[PDB]
Amino acid sequence: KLELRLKSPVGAEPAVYPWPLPVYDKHHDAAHEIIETIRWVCEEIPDLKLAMENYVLIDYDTKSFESMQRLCDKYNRAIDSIHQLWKGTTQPMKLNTRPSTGLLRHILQQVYNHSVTDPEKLNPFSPEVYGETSFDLVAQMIDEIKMTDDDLFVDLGSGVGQVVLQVAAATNCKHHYGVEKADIPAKYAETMDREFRKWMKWYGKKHAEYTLERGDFLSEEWRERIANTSVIFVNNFAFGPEVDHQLKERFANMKEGGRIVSSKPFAPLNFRINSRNLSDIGTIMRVVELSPLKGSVSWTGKPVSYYLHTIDRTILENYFSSLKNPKLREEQEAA
């Protein structure tokens, strides 16, 4: 029983792949995962990138065991020489840093490869195109929504957990949670979780704390939890009006400066407060459309945008102050 092995850049147990190399889905197989892993490790380590004939990496026979073993051996010899080099005066690769965005894309693709066996049991973008689509949206969102160790992040309806893992690897939040109700994605999420931790260690990279849970985010337990969350991500684009209504109710108890990022806005972008809409959620949040994923369209055929809501109760304060003022009250009461 033949196999291929890649040594970890930081001395974790090596990655082992049986020959013939597994096919993961229609566009992902182990051969190209191995090639990409080497390519990414080379990005981590200048010296490795120096030893490898980089353009030759594409001119390997992925169907030949000898050709692929030649590639792995070459990589492994070079890793050994790098570990020796670190024992000398040369300072080793800094440990427990966060992965670059490019590396993180590869790691999550790799985790998804080893975890999700049936993509068809899953339902703007599907999890199989995550790397080329949602990942970029999430990365853009991470860059725009600055988060600190005072934040708690929750992904409402977290599926197989991709968003949670991406955000946990990339930010400083105290904790990251994902909640998923359906058993198929929740089950896969357990594997996604184990694989992520394994692969993150394999590359020597750090992530913040996270928990992927089974549960219903509309439950009474989640009522209090949503209220104590400072950053919510929710892909609500296809949610019904009753679900969206229930979420608005839950968001209404969030603290000032709390933020919600969604694929469908929970309030109008140009909400203007008056006597008929006083109890509506637009009274207590700013809503802006964030920059789209340039050069990518949804299954709807349209560029995918995302909406940021910020809890801000001064909107309501200003409305009430104005009502006290007879000048402004007349100026408002002109319909």
Ligand X SMILES: CC(C)N(CCCNC(=O)Nc1ccc(C(C)(C)C)cc1)C[C@H]1O[C@@H](n2cc(Br)c3c(N)ncnc32)[C@H](O)[C@@H]1O
Q: Which residues are annotated as a binding site?
A: 130-133, 153-162, 180, 216-217
Interface with ligand X (CB under 6 A), residue from 109, 110, 158, 283 = 158
* Binding partner of residue 230 among Na ion, ligand X, none, CB cut-off 5 to 8 Å per kind: none
Binding-site residue set for S-adenosyl-L-methionine: 130-133, 153-162, 180, 216-217
Q: How far apart are CA 145 and CA 143, in angstroms?
A: 6
Supply 84's token pair.
Answer: 């020796």
Binding partner selected for residue 13 from ligand X, Na ion, none, CB under the kind-specific 5 to 8 Å limit: none
Q: Do the beta carbons of residue 2 and residue 91 sit within 8 Å?
A: no
| One-letter identity of residue 44 | E
| 133 binds ligand X per the rule CB under 6 A | no
* The residue count for the chain: 335
Give Dmax over CA atoms of the chain in angstroms. Answer: 87
Contacting ligand X within 87-126 (CB under 6 A): none
Give the x-and-dash track for 111-150 against Na ion (CB under 5 A): ----------------------------------------
The CA distance from 117 to 197, in Å, is 19
User: Rule CB under 5 A: which of 207-266 touch Na ion?
Assistant: none
Nearer to Na ion, 70 or 329 (CB): 70
Q: Which helix (H) or strand (E) element contains residue 28?
A: strand 28-29
Characterise 161 by phi-psi region: left (phi > 0), alpha (psi -120 to 50), beta (else). Answer: left
User: Rounded distance, CA 320 to CA 328, Å?
Assistant: 11
Binding of residue 212 to ligand X (CB under 6 A)? no
State both tokens at 186.
């929740």
Decide if 304 contacts 235 (C-beta within 8 A).
no
Question: According to the binding rule CB under 6 A, does residue 218 interact with ligand X?
Answer: yes
Cβ proximity to ligand X, 34 vs 165, nearer residue = 165
Judged by CB under 6 A, does residue 171 bind ligand X? no
**What percentage of the chain's residues is helix, strand, coil (to nearest 5)?**
45, 15, 40
Q: Which of 4, 179, 273, 284 binds ligand X (CB under 6 A)?
A: 179
**Region from 42-50, 59-67, 100-108, 216-224 binding ligand X, contact rule CB under 6 A:** 216-224
* Rounded distance between C-alpha atoms, residue 282 and residue 128, angstroms: 35
Stretch that binds ligand X, among 70-78, 231-239, 249-257, 319-327 (CB under 6 A): 231-239
Residues 181-200 that bind ligand X (CB under 6 A): 181-182, 185
Instruction: Report helix angle 134-144 to 162-170, nearest 10.
Output: 40
How many residues of this chain interact with ligand X, rule: CB under 6 A?
Answer: 25
Task: Answer yes or no whether residue 235 interacts with ligand X by CB under 6 A.
Answer: yes
**In the complex, least distance from residue 53 CB atom to Na ion, rounded to whole angstroms:** 6
Helix or strand or coil: residue 263? coil
DSSP state of 287: E
Report the nearest approach of ligand X to the CB of residue 255 (Å). 20
- CB-nearer residue toward ligand X: 21 or 304: 304
Cα(164)–Cα(197) distance, integer angstroms? 13
9 binds, among ligand X, Na ion, none (CB under 5 to 8 A by kind): none
Task: Pick between residue 127 and residue 204 the one whose CB is nearest to ligand X.
Answer: 127
Query: What residues between 46 and 65 interact with Na ion by CB under 5 A?
Result: 54
Tell me the H-state helices in the chain: 30-44, 46-51, 65-87, 101-115, 134-144, 162-170, 183-203, 220-227, 241-251, 314-324, 326-332
In the complex, least distance from residue 54 CB atom to Na ion, rounded to whole angstroms? 5
Q: Which positions touch Na ion (CB under 5 A)?
A: 54
The footprint of ligand X (CB under 6 A) covers 134, 137-138, 141, 155, 157-159, 163, 179-182, 185, 216-218, 233-235, 243, 261-263, 306
